[PDB]
Structures are given as structure tokens and as C-alpha cells.
Amino acid sequence: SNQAVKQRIRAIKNIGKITKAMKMVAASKMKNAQIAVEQSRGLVDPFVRLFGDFPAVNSNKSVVVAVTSDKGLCGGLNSNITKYTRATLATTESEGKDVVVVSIGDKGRSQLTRIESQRYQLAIADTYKVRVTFGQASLIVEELIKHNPQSYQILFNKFRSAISFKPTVATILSPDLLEKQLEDVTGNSLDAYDIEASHERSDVLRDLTEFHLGVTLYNAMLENNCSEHASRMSAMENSTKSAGEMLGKLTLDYNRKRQATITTELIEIIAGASALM
Amino acid sequence: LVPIGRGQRELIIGDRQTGKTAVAIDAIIHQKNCNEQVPKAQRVYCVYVAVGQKRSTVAQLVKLFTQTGAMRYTIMVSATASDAAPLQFLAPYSGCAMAEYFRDTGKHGLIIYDDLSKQSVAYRQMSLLLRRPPGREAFPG
Amino acid sequence: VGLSVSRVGSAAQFPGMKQVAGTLKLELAQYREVAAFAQFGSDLDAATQYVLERGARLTEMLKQKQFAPI
Amino acid sequence: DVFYLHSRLLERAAKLSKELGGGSLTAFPVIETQAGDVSAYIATNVISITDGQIFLETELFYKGIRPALNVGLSVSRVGSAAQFPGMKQVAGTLKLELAQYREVAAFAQFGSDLDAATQYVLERGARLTEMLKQKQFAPIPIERQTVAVYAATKGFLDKVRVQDIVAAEEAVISQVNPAVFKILKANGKITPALDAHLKAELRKVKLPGA
Amino acid sequence: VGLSVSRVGSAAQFPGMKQVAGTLKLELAQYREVAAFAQFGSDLDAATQYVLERGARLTEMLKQKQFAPI
Amino acid sequence: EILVTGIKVVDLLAPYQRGGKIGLFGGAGVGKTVLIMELINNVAKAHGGFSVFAGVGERTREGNDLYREMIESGVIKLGAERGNSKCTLVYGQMNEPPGARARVALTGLTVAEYFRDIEGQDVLLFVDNIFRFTQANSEVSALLGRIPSAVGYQPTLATDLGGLQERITTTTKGSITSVQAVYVPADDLTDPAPATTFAHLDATTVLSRSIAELGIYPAVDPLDSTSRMLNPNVIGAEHYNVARGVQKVLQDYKNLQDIIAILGMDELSEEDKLTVARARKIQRFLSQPFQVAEVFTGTPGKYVDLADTISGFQGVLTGKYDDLPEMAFYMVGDIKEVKEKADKMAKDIASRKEADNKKVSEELK
Amino acid sequence: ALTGLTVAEYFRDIEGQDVLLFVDNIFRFTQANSEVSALLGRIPSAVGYQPTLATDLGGLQERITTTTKGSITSVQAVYVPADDLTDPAPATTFAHLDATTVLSR
Amino acid sequence: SIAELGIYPAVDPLDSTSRMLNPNVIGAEHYNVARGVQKVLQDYKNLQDIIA
Amino acid sequence: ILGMDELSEEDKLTVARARKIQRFLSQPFQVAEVFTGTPGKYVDLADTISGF
Amino acid sequence: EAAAPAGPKEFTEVWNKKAPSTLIVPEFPSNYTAVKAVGEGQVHGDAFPVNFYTPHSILSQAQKDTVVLPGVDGYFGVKASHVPTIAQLKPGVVELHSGAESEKFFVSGGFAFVHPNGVTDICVLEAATLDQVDPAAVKSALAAASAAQPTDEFEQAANRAAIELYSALESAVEAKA
Ligand SMILES: Nc1ncnc2c1ncn2[C@@H]1O[C@H](COP(=O)(O)OP(=O)(O)OP(=O)(O)O)[C@@H](O)[C@H]1O
Ligand SMILES: Nc1ncnc2c1ncn2[C@@H]1O[C@H](COP(=O)(O)OP(=O)(O)O)[C@@H](O)[C@H]1O
Numbered sequence A: 001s002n003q004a005v006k007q008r009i010r011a012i013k014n015i016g017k018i019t020k021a022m023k024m025v026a027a028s029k030m031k032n033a034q035i036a037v038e039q040s041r042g043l044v045d046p047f048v049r050l051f052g053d054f055p056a057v058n059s060n061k062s063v064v065v066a067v068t069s070d071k072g073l074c075g076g077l078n079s080n081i082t083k084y085t086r087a088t089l090a091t092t093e094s095e096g097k098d099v100v101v102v103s104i105g106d107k108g109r110s111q112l113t114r115i116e117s118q119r120y121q122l123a124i125a126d127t128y129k130v131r132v133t134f135g136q137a138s139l140i141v142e143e144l145i146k147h148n149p150q151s152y153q154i155l156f157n158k159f160r161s162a163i164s165f166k167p168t169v170a171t172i173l174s175p176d177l178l179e180k181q182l183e184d185v186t187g188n189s190l191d192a193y194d195i196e197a198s199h200e201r202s203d204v205l206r207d208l209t210e211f212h213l214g215v216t217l218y219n220a221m222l223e224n225n226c227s228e229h230a231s232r233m234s235a236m237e238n239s240t241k242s243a244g245e246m247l248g249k250l251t252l253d254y255n256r257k258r259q260a261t262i263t264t265e266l267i268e269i270i271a272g273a274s275a276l277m
Numbered sequence B: 001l002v003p004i005g006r007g008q009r010e011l012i013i014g015d016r017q018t019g020k021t022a023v024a025i026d027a028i029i030h031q032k033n034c035n036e037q038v039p040k041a042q043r044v045y046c047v048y049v050a051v052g053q054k055r056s057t058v059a060q061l062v063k064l065f066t067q068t069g070a071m072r073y074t075i076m077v078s079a080t081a082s083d084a085a086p087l088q089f090l091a092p093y094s095g096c097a098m099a100e101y102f103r104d105t106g107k108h109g110l111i112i113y114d115d116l117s118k119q120s121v122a123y124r125q126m127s128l129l130l131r132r133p134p135g136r137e138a139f140p141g
Numbered sequence C, E: 001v002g003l004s005v006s007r008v009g010s011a012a013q014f015p016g017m018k019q020v021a022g023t024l025k026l027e028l029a030q031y032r033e034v035a036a037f038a039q040f041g042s043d044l045d046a047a048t049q050y051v052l053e054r055g056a057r058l059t060e061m062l063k064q065k066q067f068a069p070i
Numbered sequence D: 001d002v003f004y005l006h007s008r009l010l011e012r013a014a015k016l017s018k019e020l021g022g023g024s025l026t027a028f029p030v031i032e033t034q035a036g037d038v039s040a041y042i043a044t045n046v047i048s049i050t051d052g053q054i055f056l057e058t059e060l061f062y063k064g065i066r067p068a069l070n071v072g073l074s075v076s077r078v079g080s081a082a083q084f085p086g087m088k089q090v091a092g093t094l095k096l097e098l099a100q101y102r103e104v105a106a107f108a109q110f111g112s113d114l115d116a117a118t119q120y121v122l123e124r125g126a127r128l129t130e131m132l133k134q135k136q137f138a139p140i141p142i143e144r145q146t147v148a149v150y151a152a153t154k155g156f157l158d159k160v161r162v163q164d165i166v167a168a169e170e171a172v173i174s175q176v177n178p179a180v181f182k183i184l185k186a187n188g189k190i191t192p193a194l195d196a197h198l199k200a201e202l203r204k205v206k207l208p209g210a
Numbered sequence F: 001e002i003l004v005t006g007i008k009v010v011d012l013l014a015p016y017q018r019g020g021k022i023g024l025f026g027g028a029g030v031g032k033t034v035l036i037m038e039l040i041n042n043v044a045k046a047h048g049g050f051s052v053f054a055g056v057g058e059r060t061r062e063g064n065d066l067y068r069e070m071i072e073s074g075v076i077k078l079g080a081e082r083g084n085s086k087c088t089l090v091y092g093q094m095n096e097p098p099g100a101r102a103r104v105a106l107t108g109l110t111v112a113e114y115f116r117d118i119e120g121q122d123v124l125l126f127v128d129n130i131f132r133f134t135q136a137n138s139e140v141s142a143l144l145g146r147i148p149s150a151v152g153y154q155p156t157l158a159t160d161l162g163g164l165q166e167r168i169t170t171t172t173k174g175s176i177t178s179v180q181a182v183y184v185p186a187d188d189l190t191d192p193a194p195a196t197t198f199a200h201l202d203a204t205t206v207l208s209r210s211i212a213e214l215g216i217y218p219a220v221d222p223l224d225s226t227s228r229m230l231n232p233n234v235i236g237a238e239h240y241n242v243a244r245g246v247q248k249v250l251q252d253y254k255n256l257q258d259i260i261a262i263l264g265m266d267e268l269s270e271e272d273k274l275t276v277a278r279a280r281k282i283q284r285f286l287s288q289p290f291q292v293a294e295v296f297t298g299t300p301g302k303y304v305d306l307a308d309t310i311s312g313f314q315g316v317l318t319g320k321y322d323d324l325p326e327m328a329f330y331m332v333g334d335i336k337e338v339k340e341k342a343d344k345m346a347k348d349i350a351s352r353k354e355a356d357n358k359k360v361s362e363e364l365k
Numbered sequence G: 001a002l003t004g005l006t007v008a009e010y011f012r013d014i015e016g017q018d019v020l021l022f023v024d025n026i027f028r029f030t031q032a033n034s035e036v037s038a039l040l041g042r043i044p045s046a047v048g049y050q051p052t053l054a055t056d057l058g059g060l061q062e063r064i065t066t067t068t069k070g071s072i073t074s075v076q077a078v079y080v081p082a083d084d085l086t087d088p089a090p091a092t093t094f095a096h097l098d099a100t101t102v103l104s105r
Numbered sequence H: 001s002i003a004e005l006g007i008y009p010a011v012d013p014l015d016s017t018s019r020m021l022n023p024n025v026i027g028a029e030h031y032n033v034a035r036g037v038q039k040v041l042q043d044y045k046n047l048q049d050i051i052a
Numbered sequence I: 001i002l003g004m005d006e007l008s009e010e011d012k013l014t015v016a017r018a019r020k021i022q023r024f025l026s027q028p029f030q031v032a033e034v035f036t037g038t039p040g041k042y043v044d045l046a047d048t049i050s051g052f
Numbered sequence J: 001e002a003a004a005p006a007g008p009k010e011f012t013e014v015w016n017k018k019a020p021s022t023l024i025v026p027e028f029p030s031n032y033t034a035v036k037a038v039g040e041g042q043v044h045g046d047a048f049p050v051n052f053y054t055p056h057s058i059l060s061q062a063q064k065d066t067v068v069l070p071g072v073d074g075y076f077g078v079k080a081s082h083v084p085t086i087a088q089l090k091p092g093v094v095e096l097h098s099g100a101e102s103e104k105f106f107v108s109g110g111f112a113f114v115h116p117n118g119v120t121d122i123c124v125l126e127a128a129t130l131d132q133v134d135p136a137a138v139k140s141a142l143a144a145a146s147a148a149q150p151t152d153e154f155e156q157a158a159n160r161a162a163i164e165l166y167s168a169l170e171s172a173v174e175a176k177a
């Protein structure tokens, strides 16, 4: 009776303490993993300054990667990315082509194997378990060039600010398959560069697009990790204010039941004493 | 899950419109279904005590029992809501005295005191109007 | 099922049901054991997801209609 | 009989028939609640006696919104038939715009995110809210209320920032020529001859800020 | 510690304890407000982990066996 | 036998028996007079027999309103054509002393009992607030010299209410279809006066304060309203299965109500976010505009037939309307009118950018 | 508290001054009157306070006013039982308070 | 609560008390394993809320 | 949880005003100069309104 | 021939027609890139912008006047307007110059672009300056590298990379000027 609402008040009060702790844990994790995000932002732009940005290519085999998070209190992030993943995956599929869908983070595997299970070949988790490093992104990219696709769409949340996390799609073209061909206009746009490497340009572009896939995959999971912490910092803020509004309502209900209990027990005592007096 | 025994008192407790009467009715109907099968002394004779219920519900229940043939073994004691509070108070004892005939004479009885939460309210009415001092929720001691 | 008790327990039910009902009573305790851990979706090691359907099939087995005893 | 105490008192506030002089008696009982609890005994007694309610919220009152009328919970369905026409014309879209403004409550960018297509209803419901604020001991005639809310809800104060709608609506009342108030009170409705001169008067006033 | 009061207070304690316990109750209060973070794996900014280990050794400081006053 | 009222939540989830006692439980301002006026509007017109209205301790404003709205409806005719009137008003309203309010339900019952027993008719007995009978006996029993029972009521609550309510029956020679309003005293369904009268009803329609705070009218709680007609052997399995499915979805959304509060919808399973969206749909689809509520809302009334509700609630359950928005279901009659409101919501988000209406050359017109 | 009001009412009504009156714990005034009316055999009202709670408080709080000759101002220490502002003793006392000075730790 | 986990006898290990639970009475070796069981059970009772 | 460095200049100007506002609410009392030495201040209302 | 012009402007229409209209269009890394290759500028004389990059750090983003890079065909200096090149780098010392003063980072590999607008981009995985390397470890590491030669030629590819990097590092630490 009047004991259940008391322990329920205690439960909501400790949940509010827990979420206020988790909010500033995510605040500390966002504040330290922000400098790494801004440092990794430099290397992605010489390739898009060199190779450009060609999302709307016509490919025949394509690997689409959804960079999600691992822990599940992100508050509307991984659902946003699995929305954008099929929103751009249906946009670039009108040619009767092959698609391999890959997820980084097992909350992507909990959300993508029910929406595209026909095309889902790979699930990569435990990536943020200590930190993300370039050799880790390199191994993941080597698993992506295990298949031999013509393009790579990478879906992640760019850490724009501590409140805004723009979901982006980054595109990497296979060297011999589309990279020389999506630069062809009045000859070629890559012929202005004088190759100073060992072997021919079909291997320089191979090394460069493997490097470019690894670099944008490193920056993808790093930006997505910072936005995952920064959105968990806001979701736990909403959780504290919700478990504070709930505590403030349930305390008023407890005070009403408290006053009602004292009144009805006293009316029982007076009614039992007036029958004898 | 909660198997009854033959001399066991099992409480059917719940909130309103959750199916307490329904569990009791399936007990009585199943005893009709098994009485036509066992040799003459494993037969269970039911008594339904309907305290405080409205007279329409008792009419529906008698209609159901007589259309399923379960009224051959069932007594129904019916102290409805318009009856005086001593009749609702006393109808579980009347029904238990009717069903104790089968217990005392080697047969097997089964009794349902449907709305025993209403016999206590009728007893509280009698005891408060006989000016006995009230207690918890003004119930008697 | 957790709140409904009975004092006699065994020795006052069907023996054939007594063979097949203890493994239902304890398995529904396992099924209720995981219902407060089904709001997240982690689905630990095909155990907390296997009994999450096995007990859910048992509770559907225990449903029945009205005025129709078995 | 604490119900009968208030029921036999409030039933004497009647509108008599035409055989009995046609007189009337309006009642405003006042009920103080404890922590906004309207499930109290006496509060639920008098709610089930009186025709409408005027709920006043402590949250709005300590947010500067005075009169702090909870516009969702407050009703008056008997005097809704007896409304000033013209005010009835604009009050429909007034409380519909505030009704879809109450769907933007505590999640503009407080709750989860922002879609930012309903910024029009957000920055419109704010101006309708600060239109309805009013200071103490200064009651407004009804013809100057319906002109002020016509200027609010037709979009004639849509360009003004939220901080000076209190000055904008008193500038509307003081600057629009006082013939239209006499037309609106005597006709008792916004006639088709009157919305034209009203909209011609409402574009030629200097609303502050911006 | 947070709910135990003495309205006489520091006017009637040991003056050698009064200059040491004034630190003690302050950092015990600091430990009480940072009490959820003790159960966490992600360490915070070490102005809270410092008061966490300090308040833990201070609560273990004030333990006492029965019938052996000091 | 079923009595179709044309109200969606009443027809689907707790259907009314044609000769049974019907209770509308409410908490001071949730809408059990508007619901009983809509039941008079929908039921007492299509009924061929006589009606009685017992106004027991309600507003005299509403008594004059019902009298005038029955005179202009032709249900009450004044003067020489009085024999063609179909309704008898008996009024013991809340200005009367407690001895009058405690016995005026017996007057209304006696007028209905004459038409049941003697005339052999089918009667409708609307009692506005049968609670005030109990409350008036509670007022006079404090002075009769009795020891009070629980919350402050008389020790003879249940026998008083039972001796009144056992007279409102369908007998072998006539039927009284009685719709009673019950007031719950401080939004308390555990108060002894609602809890005593739950037992004398075939269909309870429990109205909720929080549902009305959502804006959903009539504010019928779908998981607190019951009926003895919700049974497959009386309404058929196609109605019973969709009613039990709607109740299952609404309960399975009620079980998520605090997780959605303290965590948000962002973390729920995608087999449960489907459940939450479907239940937010089928609890807007129980909303309905009334013909008696159109004077203070302006939206016209919607009578919905029973088969329309059963087909319209199969469709939201199976998933045939998962693409329509939630607010397309709010305050519409049928599942057809969801479709004409869903696309009208998509004209009006596109009609923002069509024209720039200016009015020229009318100053000389 | 009525003795203190009388000594202040001399300085108001006779001396013609602006008097302060410090009622230390108006709640203990309420609690003492609750005990008095319980000893006289009266039936308690809501949660257990006297039936005359509003009028026993108003007998004190209405003699603290400004008249034509002087005034009595009153700084009353308020205790709130069970951290409950809707408890009828602080709910009744707050109806008479014209200000509030909250001292924080 | 212990009996709803199927653990019988449903003795609350914390809420049970004895006068014999004293290191001078039953011995300090018994006393310390008793207090250690109660310590780990109270720590788990405090951790269940953050586990869920 | 973040720091005063990431604040706006107007979200540091309110901090710089509010700290000296809550310092300017302090006052040495005449009844404490018996044992705290600092003499007590009686502030008029006209000085208070202008000084804030 | 470019009759199929993919791009950020030409993904938007196929997205706005195929994808749902609730969503804003997803961003692209081109939207966060302020300086490009083909559109000229960025030299204004003897300066040219050098962006020396690692995955973990941004080592320089200022403007310089010459940078000498260890290409696979040997070292080569990049003046203010070099020819556009994509030069794969071997292990060696990248040397920046802004004038009289220079900073010398030893790199492990990578590439180095200079673009038709004169901006150059050095893209390496790990660049440690010569102060951070101790010479007693590179000698023993080359001794342990140029000794064990397994027949699995994946490991001899790794060994060739080892002896190349360590030898160029050892010649990079007696090459103080
Ligand atoms: N096993 C069942 N399956 C489906 N419906 C059922 C079942 N048992 C009961 N019901 C339905 O539930 C409703 C309530 O049943 P019942 O009258 O037995 O409950 P009760 O608790 O006795 O109610 P009351 O307190 O009003 O007497 C009935 O309308 C019945 O049709
Ligand atoms: N179906 C409805 N549609 C719109 N508004 C309603 C509806 N039912 C109730 N309300 C609102 O709730 C109020 C309750 O009125 P009423 O039925 O007289 O309450 P009570 O339940 O106390 O008799 C009405 O004034 C009306 O404004």
C-alpha cells in the first residue's frame, strides 16, 4: 500500500542519481575524445581534394557501411543512421546491382539484420572497447577489400557540435573500376598529376584508395564515437529531468496518501471510541 | 500450477472482472463432466453460495448450469443484494451446512463462497447497527 | 504464477501431471526471471532469448476459454 | 453534507426565465488547491457543480505569464453560446493555434531534437501567449480585446519580436482610430464592411522593435 | 552522517578534534554527493576519484567494534 | 442482446446489453453527462418505447437544458399533443435537501416500473448520478444515530444501493435498459460508493481523467471498462477477437509507460516501437466527435456503425494503416475518415506555398 | 504567543510605534493548540490537527496588523512537517504570511 | 522476495539477526564469515539497481 | 560538467555579474561587531536600489 | 567523357525523389573542405600551403616556401609552384622550410600530393621528429631485422620494409647539418 510508493520513490531517486552520473561520464568522454576527432579531420581532406566526392556513381558491386555505436543509451543516433543507410541505399540501387551491407558496432547488427538481411555479410563490434586506432580501421578496411566492390558508402555522424551531429555519407571509388572513369572529362582530370611512384598508376591509385578507405573509416568511427558520447550526454540529461519530474509528482502523491492515511486511521479510532463513550 | 486437493480451502483472490467466478464455474462444470464417469463415491457434489450478487447474475448462472446439466449435482444458495444483511451474512453458513451433508455422509462436497468479500460487509452492517464498536475499515473485531 | 501458492503441492494432484508440471513451474520461473531484462535487447548467449520464447510458449499453452473445462 | 453546503449555494446563481423578470446571477467561487491537486474533495465537489473552470497554474504564474490560465484544462461551455460575436470569430483560430502550440510544449529543443519546420507555430504561439498577458487592475473593453487578438491572430504582428508584443498591442489600441471600436461594439460582430477598414488600419501602425 | 545533527555542535567538542573533524565532515559531505560514481567503471576527472577513495577510507576509518570505546 | 450505441469505444470494447444495467463511472468533469446525453441522442431516438430520466442530484441548468432540448426535439410535446410524448422527466436536483435526493431515484424507478410491469413496454431509464442517492443517505444517516462505516458512509450502504438497484431489471414481462452515471468522489474507484455499485452492472464504462487530459473524448478507459457482452458466444468471434486484440495492444503499451518516460522511445525494441505506434493510433481511434458536443466544439458529430468499428480496428491491428500519421485518427468517425483526414493533412502542409492572397479594388464595391 | 501579542499590542496601541513580534515556531503554537483541543475532547480534523486550526491561527495572526496608531510586524519561524508544504498547518500558516525569508546552509 | 526466486528457506540474510552473532560468543572465525556474507549480499543489493 | 572556458562572453558576463551581486548581498551586522570587529552597516532602501 | 556526373549536387535530386521527405539530405566530406585542387589561388608569390598530416595529429598547416620529400625515386624539393604530382614516399626525412629555419620530421611512408592550385598535402601514417628517436635502438633493430630471413615471402616483404626504414633512419641520424 503506502510502502510501495515509498520504495518506488527510492527507485526513481536512485535512477536519477545514476543518470546524472552517466551524463557527466559521457561529458568527460566527449571532452577528451574531441581533440582526437579534430586531429583526425585533417587527413580526410587531401583525398577529397584529390579524388573528389562522387556519391551518385553507378556501380555494380558496392559496400555500404553503417557506423553505429556499441552501447545502447545513445538516444536516437543508431536509429537515425539505419534510417539514412537505407535512405541512401535505395537511392543508389536502381541499376540492378550488388550490395554488401556492413555495420560497425553491434547495435548496427541488432538493427540491420532485420531491415536488410539479404545483403548483410559483416558485423564488426567491440571497436570502441578501448580506443579506435588507425591499424584497427586498416584491418576493417582490409576486410572490406576482401570483397571487391566498385564503391564504398560510409555512413556516420559527423561531430558538428555538442548538440548537432550531421549524418554524412562518404564515398570511395575502386581504382581500376570507377576512379579513373569518374575523372574523365576532356581527357582526364588526373593526368595533370605527375606520378612519382614505383609502378604504374593502376597500383598508385590502388594504394591511394585503400589508404583513403582506411582514413575515412578511421575518421568515421572516431567522429561517430564522439557524437555517441555527446548524444548520450543529452539523453542522460533528459533522463535526469524526466526522473526528477517523476520524483516530484510521486512525492506529492506520497504526501497525499500520507495525510489521507493519518486522517483515516484517526477517524477509525474516533469512531471506535465514540461507540463506547 | 496450483493444484487443489479434496479437503483443501483454496482462495480465488483478484480484482473485479478478472475471472474469479469463471474459475469457480469451470470447477463446477468439470465436476459434472467427471461425475458421470466415476464409481458413485468419487462424485463431487457442488454448492454455489452467491452472496451479494445481483439476482440477474444468479439467473444467468442457473441458466448456464441447467443448460450444461451441472445443476443435477449443484445446490445454489443465493442471498442477493436486495436481501437483508443477515441473510447475506448467514448464507455461507447455510451453504456450508448444506454441503456438510455430503462431507459427513461419505460423499465429497465442493463449495464456492462467491463474494466472501460481501459477507463481511453484511456482517459489518449488522454489527454497526447492533452498535458494536468498529475497527479496521469499521469492520468488527 | 509467482503469487499463487498451494499448501498441498504434490501428493494431491494427478501423478501424470506431476511428472510434467514441475518442469513447467520452474521453467516459468526462468521465464519471469528475464522479463525485467527484455527492455534493452542485448539477448545474452541464446539463453535469455531462448527461454524468452520457451516460457512465452508455455504461458500461451496455459490460456483457455470460458465455460469449457478440460 | 459538505457537497450540499456548496451545491445549495451555487444553484442560486441562475438565469431566470422571462416570466420572472429575466434577471440573472453569475457566480465566481474561488477554490485554493494544494500543489495543483484538483482531485481534492472540495475541488472535485465544486467542479461538479459549477459550469466551467478557470484553472490558474503556478508554473505559468512564476514564469511571468499572468493571468496564468491553463488553456487546456479551463473550460466554460455554457457561456460559449453567450460569447461576443467577432470575438467568437477570432477566438476559434486563437485557441486552435494555441492548441497546436501546446503540442510544442517542452520539446522545442528541450525534449529530444528539433525539426524546425514548426518554428512558425512555435513563434506564433509565443506571440499569442504574450498577447493574452495583461497587468492587474486594468480590464480591457471587449471591442478593444477583439481588435487586439485580431491583430495577433491574422498575422498583423507576425514580424514583431517576442519581447515587445505588450507594447505592440497597446500601440495597436492607441493608434487605430476609435471609430472602429464603436462600429465593432454597436454591430457586435466583425461585419464584412469592417474587416476591410480594420486591415487597412492595421497595416499603417508603427509597431516597436524590429 | 548527513542526517545526524547536533544543535550544540562544535562549541562542545574536543578542541584537538574540532580542528581535525571540520575537515572530516566536509570531505564526508563531498563524498556523499559523489556517491553514485563509486560503482562505475569509467573513471572520472580525479577530483572526484580522489574524494571517492578518500571518503571510502574515511568511512572505513570511523568503523568501530562493539564494547570497545576509544 | 446487444444494444449498438454508435460510439466506437463503447461498441468495440464494452458493448451494451439491450436490457441490462449500464454504468458510466466518472470523476467530476470527465464527461459522463455528455456521454449520457449522447446515449440519449443515439439510443432513445431509435428506441420505440418510453424513456425516463431521473435527475438525481445534478445541475438544474442541465435539467432545463434537457427539457428544452427535448421539447425542440419533439420527444416532449406540450399541451394537447402530450400523449405523443415519449419521455418522463423526474428531477430531484442538487439544490434539494438530502431527503429529496435520496428518494427521487425511487420515483423515477416507479415511473419506469409501471411501464415495465403494467404496460409491458421496453423502457430506458437514464439516471444522472446514482451516486447522489448514496451521498444523500450518507448525509441523513449521520443524524439517524448510526455508527459510520468506512470512509464516512452509512453502515447500510450496500443494502440501500442493492434494494434500489435490484428493482431496475429486465423481468419476464418487460425490460428496463438503464444507463446510470456514477460519480467517483475524488477520482477514487476504491471509494465504497463506486466499488459497491460496480457489482450491480452488466456494462461499466469507466471514464478517466488522464484520458481527458490527453484530449481524447469520450474519455473512456479501455482497460477499466468491462461488459458481460464481451463474450464470443453473444457478439461473435470476429468482434471479440479484435476487441481483445485492441485491449492487448493498449495494455502492452501501458507496460512500457515508465520506460518511455525515463529513457525515451529511442531505446525500445523495433518490435515494441511498432506496438507503441499502433497503440498511439488505436487510442486516438477511440476518440469520436459527438452530436451533443458539436455546440461547444464545432466539429460535427459522427455516428459509427458497429461493423465499421470492427473493420476499422482490424486494420490498425494488422498493419493496414501503419503509414497514416497518429493525428489522422483523432476525432474522426470511421477508418474511411482517417484516409480523408490523412491526405487533408498533406494538402495543408503543401497549401502553405501556393498563393499570395491580396484583395484589390473593393473600396468602391 | 498571545502574551507576546499583548506586550506588542501595548507598544502599538498606546505608544504608537512600529513593533516587531518574533513568534518563534508558529508551528509549535499550532501544535500546542492541537494538543489543547485534543485534551478538551474535540474530534480532530484533517491529518490530526484541531478542527479550529484556521480560526486558532487567525486569532493570533489577525491581531498582527497596522492600525491608525501603529503597527505590529511579525517575523515568524516556520517549521514544515514531513517536508510537506500541503500539510494543513503550514498550508494554513502560509495563507497569513506576507513574505518569506529562506536562510540556506 | 527470497521465495519468489525459488530459494527455500526464504530467510532474509540481512534482515535476520541474532544475539549469538558476536565474536565473543560463536567465535571470530564464524563471525567474520557471517559478516562477510552479509557484506557481499548488501553490496549486491546496492548494485542491482545500477545493473538493471 | 564542461568548464568556464567553453562559455560565451555573455555567458561569462552573467557569471561575473552574479558573483559580485551575491557578494553584494552580504552585510556586516551591528550585532556582530561585539565579537567580529568589523562595524555594522545600516543600508537605506534608496542606497540599495541604486547600488544594485 | 562525363555524361554521368556524380556529385553532391547530383545526389540531391535522386535522393529527394527516391528517399523520404522527412529527412534532410546527408552531408558529404566535400561540404567540410574549404580548399581544393583545380580552382587556382593559394600561392600569391613564393609561399604555398603545406598540410602535413598523420591519422593521429595535424603536424603543420601553415604556408612554406620549400619542402623536400623522400619519394620512391629519391628526395625532391617542392617549391612554391611545383608541377602537380602524386609522389609515393619512402621512409625518410620530410623537411619543411619557411625561410632560414627548418623542421625535419622523419616519416615512415605515405604519399605526398601537390595540387594544381599549388597547395601540397603530405599524408603519412607516422611521423616522429629526429629528437624523439634514439639511435641505440635502431641499430639493434636493424641487426635483428637484417639477420632472420624467413622463406615465407610475406615475412620477407615485412623484412624488406624493416631494413629500408631502419637503414634510412640510421642514415637520417648521422646526417645532421
Ligand atoms: N478464461 C477466460 N477467457 C476469456 N474470458 C474470460 C475468461 N474468464 C473470464 N472471462 C471474462 O471475464 C469477465 C469477468 O469474469 P468473472 O465474472 O468470472 O470475473 P469476476 O471477478 O467474478 O467479476 P465480478 O467481480 O464482476 O463478479 C467475464 O465477462 C468473462 O466473460
Ligand atoms: N465527448 C466530449 N467532447 C468534447 N468535450 C467533452 C466531451 N465530454 C466531456 N467534455 C468536456 O468535459 C466537460 C465535462 O462535462 P460534464 O459531462 O457535464 O461533466 P460531468 O462528468 O461532471 O457530468 C464538458 O464541459 C466538456 O467541455
Ligand SMILES: [Mg+2]
Binding pocket: B020, B021, B114, B115
Ligand atoms: Mg464474481
Ligand SMILES: [Mg+2]
Binding pocket: F032, F033, F058, F059
Ligand atoms: Mg453531471
